[PDB]
Amino acid sequence: YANCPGLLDEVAMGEMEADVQALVRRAARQLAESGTPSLTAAVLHTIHVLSAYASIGPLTGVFRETGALDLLMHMLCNPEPQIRRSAGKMLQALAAHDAGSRAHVLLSLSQQ
Amino acid sequence: LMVPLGPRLQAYPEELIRQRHDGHPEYLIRWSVLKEHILMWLSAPEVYANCPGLEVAMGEMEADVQALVRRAARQLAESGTPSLTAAVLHTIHVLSAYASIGPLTGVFRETGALDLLMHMLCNPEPQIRRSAGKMLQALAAHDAGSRAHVLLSLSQQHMDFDSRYTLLELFAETTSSEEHCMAFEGIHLPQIPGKLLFSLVKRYLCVTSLLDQLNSRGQRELEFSMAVGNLISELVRSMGWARNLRSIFQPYPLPYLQPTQAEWWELLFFIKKLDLCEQQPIFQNLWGEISVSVEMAESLLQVLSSRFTLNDLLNSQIYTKYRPLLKRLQQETQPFLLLLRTLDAPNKTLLLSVLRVITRLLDFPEAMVLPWHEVLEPCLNCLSDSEIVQELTCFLHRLASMHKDYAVVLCCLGAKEILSKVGCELRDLVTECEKYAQLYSNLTSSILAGCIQMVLGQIEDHRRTHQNIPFFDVFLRHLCQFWPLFREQLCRRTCLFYTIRAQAWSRDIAEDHRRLLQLCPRLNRVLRHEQNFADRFLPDDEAAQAL
């Protein structure tokens, strides 16, 4: 109020969070099925969709709330190199929103 | 697979982008060149020859996009809140993310999203407008044709020249596709005034839309013919350059060396140029593949010439082989060229008469038909006699006080620095708006490059057709008489095309050895077509030998 006062519909946000939860479920289903390149390409498309979902600013609380972190970590341990790079880009896009997600992600990534 | 392009140039493909006389699915692919990157259209057998390697979720995402658009309808209908714009912005983020997927383009177009973009056109929020532009850019990345359609629906809406400039600049920024992306020339392409730019932009949009939609077939023939003709005519006019106009392969008899429709094409184009009242009698007298006699063509040419831009046709080749002063200058724009040349020459009597005449003639607004602008190059480049210099400055000032479009034309001419070097109010005239020269340069260069892309791509596509767009001779000839750089582009294009075809033929022949007996006539036909191309469209025997 003293220095800069001027600087002072989430249903769709939560809906997209739940939809991303279903999408991550389907993506992990494809990851368990990642023995055929068709499902691998579909999983890459799903990961692109997941990143686009991650492009939001304020919904990081839901993004972690859906427990996407562990699924993403498993995806980083997948032998899909291009998909691994894409997931890394998605995590980096996530990083600007919050630091704690990144810290926990890499920290769990270390204990392998 | 590595493609040997040149002594230092090599190439290699990147990915499939799209699909489509074959009547079969096809594929357009980009190719990175290591020594920029090129784009090409191939066919599935040629794909297997050269590029061997390269579901219900689509339905789910389509339902998501449809429902999202339905929600965004209300998200935009309630644009009266600080949260309204932000929710619309989030919706736009989701959309532009979705439309970056190939299949989503048809869904968005089928979703009536043109209505959404239209509601975005009237955006007082510059953030919302630029976000819609970003969405359109993503749509163009998805598919150029859908982007053309959307921008046309935007164009489907005498508006303010400033508003016109705003809309056109937005469209130029948004539609800077990879095709619109092109190499800077580095050589002086002359100034392009504003209204010419707007008209040519409209024509280019028409041409691109028709070309994308190309694939009875006579409809496609007429569409491509009319679009290419109008574009070539407008580009020649705005450039104004129309006022200036043995063995093919060896360095026994050659079977290919031993062996008009385009005239009818010009005739039909001009008959289409005639209005309904004008064109109807000629069409009735005629009553796309009309067979005629030379006398019939002469009669049609006379009938066309007998009624009424006309001087532009008078400067053509088909005419060879087969307040009153303002209207007069309209009938003969070459008289305007003569006036400009007369001013384009010492003594003070001639130049004084020229200056006084221009001043006393501009007083009548009837100059709207005349361009009155082509001279502006030397009026600032050359002029420095005291009275003469004052007269030139006052003439520029009068032009500035007349038209803000002509003011922008002088702004591109950079009259600010010169009038600062000077008898100075013209500098203040130039100090009206200095934030449009980048727009002028960008739009002009991009449009010229786009036209060159169109012609080169058409020739490449015809290479498989082996069978005439109006005035195409004029454009390629003017570009033929720059030519080093564009010639480099042409030879690179031909090299890639023919390498792909040759590898395809070799792969086919490897299957069965009986193929060569049928192979020989194929080479005959190909070499014949190349010889025809070289004979019709290439002056320098050295150029033909290089090709």
**Integer angstrom CA distances of residue B180 from B139, B231, B440:** 14, 16, 15
Nearest to B4 by CA among B506, B464, B498: B498
Residue of chain A whose Cα is closest to the Cα of B82: A9
Integer Cα distance of B366 and A26 in angstroms: 70
DSSP B391: H
Sheet with B26-34, side-by-side order of all strands:
B3-4, B10-16, B26-34, B37-43
Helix, coil or strand: residue B14: strand
Mutation choice for A interface testing from B70, B81, B94, B98 by most A CBs within 10 A: B94
Q: Computed from CA positions of residues B350, B352, B354, B356, in that sequence, does the dihedral angle turn out positive or negative?
A: negative
Residue whose structure tokens are 């016109």: B164
Rounded to whole angstroms, how far apart are CA atoms B293 and B11? 50
C-alpha torsion angle, residues B262, B266, B271, B273 (rounded to 10): 140
Instruction: Report the distance separating Cα B231 and Cα A40, nearest Å.
Output: 46
**CA–CA gap between residue B160 and residue B225 (Å, rounded):** 32
Residues of A with CB under 8 A from a CB of B: 9, 12-13, 16, 19, 42, 45-46, 49, 52, 55-56
Q: How far is B77 from chain A (nearest CA, A)?
A: 14
Amino acid in position B155 = S
Contacts of B190 (CB under 8 A, 6+ apart): B239, B377
Contact assignment for A52 to B57 by CB distance below 8 Å = no
Residues of chain B in contact with residue A46, where contact means CB-CB under 8 angstroms, are 57
Question: For testing the chain B interface, which of A7, A8, A9, A86 should be mutated: the one with the most B CBs within 10 Å?
Answer: A9
CA distances, B499 to each of B46, B368, B526, B529 (Å)? 10, 53, 14, 17
In degrees to the nearest 10, what's the CA dihedral of A55, A56, A58, A59? -90
CB contact under 8 A, A42 and B98: no
Handedness of CA B325, B329, B334, B339 (dihedral sign): positive
Comparing CB atoms, the residue among B71, B91, B97 nearest residue A52 is: B97
The reply to whether residue B94 touches residue A52, judged by beta carbons under 8 angstroms, is yes
- DSSP-assigned states of every residue in B169-187: HHHHHHT--TTT------S
Cβ contacts (< 8 Å) between A9 and chain B: which residues?
Answer: 75, 83, 86-87, 90
> Is the backbone of residue B226 left (phi > 0), alpha (psi -120 to 50) or beta?
alpha
Q: Which long-range contacts (CB under 8 A, 24 or more apart) does B80-87 make?
A: B83/A9, B85/B125, B85/B127, B85/B128, B86/A9, B87/A9, B87/A12
Angle between helices B144-155 and B194-213 (to 10 degrees): 130
Q: How far apart are CA B380 and CA B415, in angstroms?
A: 7
Q: What distance in Å separates residue A111's CA from the closest CA in chain B?
A: 34
Give Cα separations from B466 to B354, B460, B531, B544 (angstroms): 54, 10, 12, 18
DSSP 8-state class, residue B413:
T
Residue A52's closest chain B neighbor by CA?
B97
A12 vs B55, B61, B71: nearest CB: B71
Place of tokens 């019939």: B296
Q: In angstroms, what separates the C-alpha of A9 from chain B's closest C-alpha?
A: 7
Interchain CB contacts (distance < 8 Å): A and B:
26
Check: CB of residue A110 under 8 Å from CB of residue A104.
Answer: no
Resolution for this PDB entry, in angstroms: 4.4
Outline where B385-482 has alpha helix (H).
386-402, 404-412, 415-421, 425-430, 437-465, 472-480
What is the distance between the alpha carbons of residues B343 and B345, in angstroms, rounded to a whole number? 6
8 Å CB contact between B30 and B15:
yes
Nearest CA in chain B to A10: B87
Instruction: Tell me the C-alpha to C-alpha distance, in Å, between residue B465 and each of B21, B38, B495, B498, B528.
Output: 8, 22, 18, 15, 13
Nearest residue to B96 via CA among B125, B68, B58: B68
Inter-chain CB proximity A13 and B90 less than 8 Å: yes
> Are B133 and B151 within 8 A, CB to CB?
no
Q: Residues with Cβ < 8 Å from A55, sequence gap 6 or more?
A: A93, B93, B97
CA-only gyration radius of chain B, Å: 27
Residue A56: its chain B contacts at CB < 8 A?
A: 90, 93
Shortest CA distance from B56: residue in chain A:
A42
Residue B359, token pair as written in the block: 């001043």
Chain A closest CA to B91's CA: distance in Å? 9
What does the alpha-carbon distance between residue B364 and residue B291 come to, in Å, rounded to a whole number? Answer: 49
Given a contact cutoff of 8 angstroms between Cβ atoms, the answer to whether B385 and B345 are in contact is no
**Which residue type is seen at B21?**
H
Residue A67 phi, psi dihedral angles, 5° rounding? 65, 35
Instruction: Give the angle subtended at the CA of B347 by the CAs of B342 and B351, to the nearest 5°.
Output: 40
For B433, the token pair is: 């708006």
C-alpha to C-alpha distances, B22 to B184, B263, B459, nearest whole angstrom: 35, 28, 17
The Cα–Cα gap between B191 and B44 comes to: 44
